[PDB]
Tab-separated table of N, CA, C and O and ligand atoms in Angstrom:
chain	number	residue	atom	x	y	z
A	1	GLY	N	18.013	-5.861	10.508
A	1	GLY	CA	17.904	-6.741	9.311
A	1	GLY	C	17.468	-8.106	9.863
A	1	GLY	O	17.252	-8.226	11.076
A	2	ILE	N	17.374	-9.091	8.984
A	2	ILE	CA	16.971	-10.403	9.520
A	2	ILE	C	18.041	-10.943	10.425
A	2	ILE	O	17.713	-11.638	11.387
A	3	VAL	N	19.309	-10.691	10.205
A	3	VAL	CA	20.385	-11.212	11.061
A	3	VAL	C	20.324	-10.654	12.467
A	3	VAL	O	20.597	-11.388	13.438
A	4	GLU	N	19.931	-9.393	12.637
A	4	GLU	CA	19.821	-8.828	13.980
A	4	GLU	C	18.659	-9.471	14.747
A	4	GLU	O	18.703	-9.716	15.944
A	5	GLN	N	17.635	-9.605	13.904
A	5	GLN	CA	16.380	-10.128	14.451
A	5	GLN	C	16.348	-11.624	14.675
A	5	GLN	O	15.707	-11.983	15.699
A	6	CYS	N	17.003	-12.372	13.800
A	6	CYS	CA	16.915	-13.843	13.947
A	6	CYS	C	18.144	-14.584	14.355
A	6	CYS	O	17.969	-15.736	14.835
A	7	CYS	N	19.302	-14.003	14.224
A	7	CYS	CA	20.565	-14.680	14.641
A	7	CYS	C	21.099	-14.062	15.922
A	7	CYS	O	21.374	-14.707	16.954
A	8	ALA	N	21.241	-12.744	15.932
A	8	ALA	CA	21.729	-12.106	17.173
A	8	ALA	C	20.667	-12.196	18.255
A	8	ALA	O	21.044	-12.187	19.437
A	9	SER	N	19.363	-12.279	17.932
A	9	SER	CA	18.290	-12.406	18.934
A	9	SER	C	17.375	-13.512	18.458
A	9	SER	O	17.600	-14.046	17.368
A	10	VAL	N	16.400	-13.938	19.221
A	10	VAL	CA	15.535	-15.074	18.810
A	10	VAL	C	14.564	-14.619	17.742
A	10	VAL	O	14.035	-13.493	17.791
A	11	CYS	N	14.456	-15.511	16.775
A	11	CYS	CA	13.613	-15.301	15.606
A	11	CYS	C	12.176	-15.602	15.949
A	11	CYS	O	11.934	-16.107	17.057
A	12	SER	N	11.283	-15.335	15.003
A	12	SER	CA	9.853	-15.643	15.247
A	12	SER	C	9.271	-15.963	13.887
A	12	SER	O	9.984	-15.660	12.868
A	13	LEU	N	8.056	-16.519	13.792
A	13	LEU	CA	7.516	-16.790	12.465
A	13	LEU	C	7.139	-15.496	11.807
A	13	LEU	O	7.301	-15.344	10.579
A	14	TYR	N	6.690	-14.527	12.568
A	14	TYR	CA	6.312	-13.212	12.016
A	14	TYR	C	7.472	-12.578	11.263
A	14	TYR	O	7.209	-12.038	10.176
A	15	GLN	N	8.672	-12.532	11.820
A	15	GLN	CA	9.874	-11.974	11.272
A	15	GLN	C	10.214	-12.763	10.025
A	15	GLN	O	10.428	-12.116	8.972
A	16	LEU	N	10.257	-14.101	10.080
A	16	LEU	CA	10.568	-14.878	8.862
A	16	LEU	C	9.637	-14.615	7.714
A	16	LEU	O	10.108	-14.397	6.609
A	17	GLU	N	8.339	-14.614	7.943
A	17	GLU	CA	7.328	-14.380	6.911
A	17	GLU	C	7.414	-13.029	6.261
A	17	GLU	O	6.901	-12.830	5.134
A	18	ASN	N	8.092	-12.108	6.916
A	18	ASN	CA	8.321	-10.756	6.459
A	18	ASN	C	9.384	-10.801	5.341
A	18	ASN	O	9.482	-9.774	4.653
A	19	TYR	N	10.084	-11.938	5.237
A	19	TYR	CA	11.049	-11.966	4.126
A	19	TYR	C	10.607	-12.908	3.038
A	19	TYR	O	11.433	-13.200	2.116
A	20	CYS	N	9.414	-13.423	3.125
A	20	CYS	CA	8.968	-14.327	2.039
A	20	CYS	C	8.411	-13.474	0.913
A	20	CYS	O	7.977	-12.351	1.260
A	21	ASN	N	8.361	-13.930	-0.330
A	21	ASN	CA	7.737	-13.100	-1.386
A	21	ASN	C	6.198	-13.283	-1.360
A	21	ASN	O	5.579	-14.013	-0.534
B	1	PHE	N	9.929	-24.400	14.909
B	1	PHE	CA	11.402	-24.615	14.927
B	1	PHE	C	12.107	-23.289	14.645
B	1	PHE	O	13.344	-23.236	14.571
B	2	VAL	N	11.310	-22.254	14.473
B	2	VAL	CA	11.861	-20.922	14.135
B	2	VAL	C	12.084	-20.040	15.336
B	2	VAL	O	12.691	-18.975	15.154
B	3	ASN	N	11.627	-20.438	16.516
B	3	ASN	CA	11.809	-19.566	17.712
B	3	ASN	C	13.121	-19.894	18.422
B	3	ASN	O	13.145	-20.409	19.557
B	4	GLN	N	14.266	-19.594	17.783
B	4	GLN	CA	15.604	-19.798	18.324
B	4	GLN	C	16.512	-18.875	17.509
B	4	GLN	O	15.943	-18.212	16.626
B	5	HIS	N	17.792	-19.011	17.876
B	5	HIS	CA	18.795	-18.184	17.127
B	5	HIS	C	19.131	-18.968	15.864
B	5	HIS	O	19.684	-20.098	15.957
B	6	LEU	N	18.842	-18.389	14.711
B	6	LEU	CA	19.039	-18.981	13.377
B	6	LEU	C	20.051	-18.124	12.662
B	6	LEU	O	19.750	-16.954	12.368
B	7	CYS	N	21.250	-18.627	12.341
B	7	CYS	CA	22.283	-17.876	11.690
B	7	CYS	C	22.843	-18.565	10.444
B	7	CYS	O	22.894	-19.794	10.471
B	8	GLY	N	23.238	-17.753	9.498
B	8	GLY	CA	23.880	-18.295	8.290
B	8	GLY	C	22.988	-19.261	7.530
B	8	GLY	O	21.817	-18.886	7.375
B	9	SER	N	23.547	-20.422	7.173
B	9	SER	CA	22.736	-21.384	6.389
B	9	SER	C	21.528	-21.900	7.141
B	9	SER	O	20.505	-22.266	6.477
B	10	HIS	N	21.580	-21.849	8.462
B	10	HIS	CA	20.468	-22.292	9.322
B	10	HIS	C	19.319	-21.328	9.118
B	10	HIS	O	18.137	-21.771	9.077
B	11	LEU	N	19.561	-20.030	8.992
B	11	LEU	CA	18.545	-19.005	8.757
B	11	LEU	C	17.964	-19.178	7.377
B	11	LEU	O	16.729	-19.114	7.127
B	12	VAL	N	18.817	-19.346	6.379
B	12	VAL	CA	18.390	-19.492	4.974
B	12	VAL	C	17.542	-20.747	4.847
B	12	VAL	O	16.544	-20.738	4.111
B	13	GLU	N	17.924	-21.839	5.491
B	13	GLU	CA	17.075	-23.035	5.402
B	13	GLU	C	15.762	-22.772	6.108
B	13	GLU	O	14.704	-23.230	5.577
B	14	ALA	N	15.649	-22.045	7.225
B	14	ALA	CA	14.330	-21.786	7.819
B	14	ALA	C	13.497	-20.969	6.828
B	14	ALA	O	12.300	-21.325	6.695
B	15	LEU	N	14.046	-19.989	6.113
B	15	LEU	CA	13.361	-19.173	5.111
B	15	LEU	C	12.860	-20.002	3.955
B	15	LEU	O	11.738	-19.999	3.423
B	16	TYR	N	13.703	-20.903	3.463
B	16	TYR	CA	13.375	-21.798	2.388
B	16	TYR	C	12.216	-22.633	2.864
B	16	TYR	O	11.244	-22.795	2.082
B	17	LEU	N	12.243	-23.187	4.072
B	17	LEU	CA	11.112	-24.016	4.528
B	17	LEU	C	9.831	-23.289	4.826
B	17	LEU	O	8.772	-23.805	4.396
B	18	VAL	N	9.771	-22.190	5.502
B	18	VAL	CA	8.601	-21.457	5.866
B	18	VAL	C	8.000	-20.775	4.646
B	18	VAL	O	6.760	-20.764	4.592
B	19	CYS	N	8.830	-20.259	3.755
B	19	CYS	CA	8.292	-19.496	2.622
B	19	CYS	C	7.748	-20.327	1.503
B	19	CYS	O	6.870	-19.842	0.752
B	20	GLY	N	8.287	-21.517	1.349
B	20	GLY	CA	7.758	-22.354	0.243
B	20	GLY	C	7.994	-21.709	-1.119
B	20	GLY	O	8.981	-20.999	-1.416
B	21	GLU	N	7.006	-22.045	-1.959
B	21	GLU	CA	6.994	-21.580	-3.367
B	21	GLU	C	6.961	-20.080	-3.571
B	21	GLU	O	7.271	-19.551	-4.670
B	22	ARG	N	6.632	-19.318	-2.556
B	22	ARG	CA	6.594	-17.866	-2.541
B	22	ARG	C	8.049	-17.392	-2.692
B	22	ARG	O	8.284	-16.339	-3.311
B	23	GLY	N	8.955	-18.202	-2.130
B	23	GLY	CA	10.374	-17.731	-2.240
B	23	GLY	C	10.538	-16.659	-1.161
B	23	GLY	O	9.575	-16.352	-0.436
B	24	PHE	N	11.727	-16.100	-1.077
B	24	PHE	CA	12.164	-15.116	-0.078
B	24	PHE	C	13.361	-14.339	-0.622
B	24	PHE	O	13.979	-14.565	-1.692
B	25	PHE	N	13.695	-13.390	0.234
B	25	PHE	CA	14.837	-12.495	0.036
B	25	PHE	C	15.637	-12.566	1.342
B	25	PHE	O	15.155	-12.492	2.473
B	26	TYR	N	16.929	-12.767	1.122
B	26	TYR	CA	17.911	-12.851	2.245
B	26	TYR	C	18.880	-11.697	2.125
B	26	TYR	O	19.802	-11.700	1.272
B	27	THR	N	18.713	-10.667	2.957
B	27	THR	CA	19.608	-9.441	2.861
B	27	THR	C	20.292	-9.331	4.200
B	27	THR	O	19.728	-8.835	5.180
B	28	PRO	N	21.485	-9.918	4.274
B	28	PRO	CA	22.246	-9.985	5.523
B	28	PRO	C	22.805	-8.643	5.951
B	28	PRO	O	22.994	-8.433	7.165
B	29	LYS	N	23.074	-7.795	4.974
B	29	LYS	CA	23.620	-6.470	5.350
B	29	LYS	C	22.431	-5.535	5.192
B	29	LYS	O	21.998	-5.298	4.052
B	30	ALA	N	21.932	-5.116	6.342
B	30	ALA	CA	20.765	-4.204	6.346
B	30	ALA	C	21.116	-2.985	7.199
B	30	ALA	O	20.497	-1.927	6.929
C	1	NA	NA1	14.719	-11.345	17.748
């Protein structure tokens, strides 16, 4: 989920943009 | 500013800033 990807490990702009509408 | 560990409200604020007017979805339990 985003928490695994961005909090437990380092986030990226690619991952963030994947949750934008 | 997004290439770090972003958790909780810090994550939601990065989403709010990067996504803009497009908005986003925050699903913490995946
Ligand atoms: Na990561």
